[PDB]
Assembly symmetry: D2
Homo-oligomer: 121 residues x 4
């Protein structure tokens, strides 16, 4: 799925995920969030299954963004875990975890959970 994954994707919030899938299972690119304490692009890296099952299952992948770039530092990181589903209406269906740096006393409240669906349109 190297060719299927590589490219520009967009989620239901309007965010823009720009990724390149390597032959070796790497994911590299940039993310730009339409919401939250974010502006412009941020580095991302991640990994995907480069030899998925051939039975119609999706392709497992994940990636991370730390929310620091030249413009802002939100002292936080998001990880997306999901699967690519190929075809005419290709999708990446994810669940994510956003952790903010906290004191020990506040660590119970450190982590948001949600779900993003990415399309090529």
């Amino acid at each position: 799925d190297e060719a299927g994954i590589t490219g520009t994707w967009y989620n239901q919030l309007g965010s823009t995920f720009i990724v390149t899938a390597g032959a070796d299972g790497a994911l590299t690119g940039t993310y730009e969030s339409a919401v939250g304490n974010a502006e412009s692009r941020y580095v991302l890296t991640g990994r995907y299954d480069s030899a998925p099952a051939t039975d119609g299952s999706g392709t497992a992948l994940g990636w991370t963004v730390a929310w620091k770039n030249n413009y802002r530092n939100a002292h936080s990181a998001t990880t997306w875990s999901g699967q690519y589903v190929g075809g005419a209406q290709a999708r990446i269906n994810t669940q994510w975890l956003l952790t903010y740096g906290t004191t020990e006393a506040n660590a119970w409240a450190s982590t948001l959970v949600g779900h993003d669906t990415f399309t090529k349109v």
Copy 2:
């Protein structure tokens, strides 16, 4: 926290996380799970906040493993999202999402959630 994070960490299951933290916010290394459909080491990559708050908050980070290497392919990826807490008893406290490639009909059941705490001992 480049120096604090770089090194060999171990979780409550006995898994071994070997990471290098780059000046630029990168995390690279290897993971070896003590449980599940895994053997030997797997590539990891991720990101961390290279300019954390100085008020005692933790350092936000995350990373991914796709569970393919030369030995096995578990058609799955885990993402850990968490924070590094420095000091005498340093820790990485994480929550994780493990997604398995599924058919559309089974996608409701595609994703495990859990929590790992990493120590240097």
Copy 3:
């Protein structure tokens, strides 16, 4: 939102959630899953905010199903946590956690996470 919540709801899988909202914040009813190790109806209970904010925010609620009834026992429980959003296209937007009873050795793998959206149609 007692009147808004009480009734029959349906999710994106085809499952059927039948609930009554009490003046006191209680939720009682039945759930019938279209997927998984389930047949027929199962008891549910839960709670909702009976005095929500008046600024356009949603109404927080949650509920549980243990997957035992007269037909089957899946040795598992799901909890849905979410919010009711009223209006012409009313919705309950949830995230859920499904825990299966495991041995200690398998407890790392005990919990699925996902997301269901309920509509009145």
Copy 4:
């Protein structure tokens, strides 16, 4: 596990969970959080597997708290999903989802995730 579950439990934050397990699978009681926008006791309800496996697996259960009582309204609900593990050092091991009522624009950020372990001591 009716007798095993019924009673007063305490988590790693110092919160106090007071529950009664019914023969029919019901859980009823009160919760008092040591942290967050909470004071005093709040109603809880939930469900547990009243006929667990006899192979050493844990007992699946869950419960909800809406964070409204006579003192405060935090416009939020938590659901805990987990398993009871009996024996000399009995435990309830949970993962939880806390949803706050939000506008549509903020709904991406509506839900915290975490994990609580309850003991009888």
